[PDB]
Each structure stands twice: as C-alpha cells, then as structure tokens.
Amino acid sequence: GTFGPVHFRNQVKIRRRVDINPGHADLSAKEAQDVIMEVVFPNEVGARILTSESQLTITKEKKKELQDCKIAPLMVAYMLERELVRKTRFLPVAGGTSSVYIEVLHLTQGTCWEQMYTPGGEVRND
C-alpha cells in the first residue's frame, strides 16, 4: 500500500451498506457453497453438480492447492466460505465503499481528517 498526505477536513460520514468480503463476482451463494462442498467434502456433495466454467476452474485450483492438507476440514470450509460468499454490512463511510477500502476504513477516514491511502494489489475493473 501507498500513503499520501493527511488532510484535515470536515468529514461527513454517511451510513450505508458496504462490502466486507467481496467474494467471487461470478459466483452466487449457491455457487460458492457448491464449490466449497465439492472441494472440502467431495464425497458428501450429494445430488448437486457443478454447472459453470468458473465453478469448475475454482474447484480445480482449490483441489490442486489443498493437496495433502491435514488442516481441519471445518476450518478449510469456513475460510473458503469467507473468501467466496459475499458479505456486506452497514458502516459510516466517507470514501470508497469497496472491500479493499472498507477494511482500512478506520485508518483512512477519520472524524476530522482523511489519510490518502492506495491499497496494494490489483483493483476490480467493475
């Protein structure tokens, strides 16, 4: 991340719904669970079947990454759910509402100041 100057201003934070976990943009709740189940409990999947190129790619990548993993399956499923299912919460925001910005909301937007911050990594085109 990159830090810019801190500007003292009269911050007016409005309460609205913002993204906590962006999840996967091409998968819905159901799609996420379908991949989760298939990756963590391939035998207990049930009648559900993967029906999307995105689901197949994610399942293949996670299975390749989770080879010989002795971690407790419940933790793996919980972490996958965190990474995939979209989660939103009402927060008093003044700047960007993206997850990359909401997570550092405490550091960037204050009651009488704003910290110019540019989170690392790539940003979603949308």
Binding site: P42, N43, E44, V45, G46, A47, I49
Partner: protein, 103 residues
C-alpha cells in the same frame, strides 16, 4: 386387501425398506397400495441383482450361494437402492470420485 398381500408375499427387510422409502417420499403406505407393491418389487429385484455375486482374487466374477465369511470375496454389486437418498448419493460420490466414472 393389498398391504396384507405385500406383508405375506415379500421379505421382512424388503417391506421395511419399501415402507420407509414411502415415508421419506411423502405418500402414506396404507393408502397408495399399488405404489407400495411396485416399490417392493423394484427393491427386491435391485437387491437380487447383487445376491451371491462376488469377485475373486483374479478379478473374475463368481457366484457363491452359501456365503463363507472367511473367504476373501468382494461383492461385485453395491446396491445404491434401499438406502436414504443422502446415504445413496454419498455412495454415488464415493464411487465417482474414486473410480472416476461420471456421476
């Protein structure tokens, strides 16, 4: 009428399996008697399609009516039918994920 005929013309576990499946399906066993008999015939035939059939050490299919418990015989057929959906589909996934056959 019909329920008594099914009780008298089928094995205890067969009628038990059929009736339980009826309960999980939603229909009452004492009302939809034709369905009950059809289910019992189906279950019976499915289970017969695996009775006495085993695989020996050479991988060849053999038939053993008097099943010896000390003989290392692997059943040739695994009955998916007669179990709860969940358990059945669990067996389906176990077979697909290990053998590789499409689900």
């Amino acid at each position: 009428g019909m329920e008594d005929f099914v009780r008298q013309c089928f094995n205890p576990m067969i009628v038990e399996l059929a009736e339980k499946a009826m309960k999980e399906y939603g229909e009452d066993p004492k009302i939809e008697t034709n369905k009950f008999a059809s289910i019992c015939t189906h279950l019976e035939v499915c289970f017969m399609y695996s009775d006495f059939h085993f695989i020996d050490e050479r991988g060849e299919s053999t038939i053993i009516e008097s099943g010896d418990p000390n003989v290392l015989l692997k059943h040739r057929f695994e009955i998916i039918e007669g179990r709860d959906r969940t358990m059945a589909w669990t067996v389906v996934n176990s077979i697909c994920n290990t053998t590789g056959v499409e689900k």
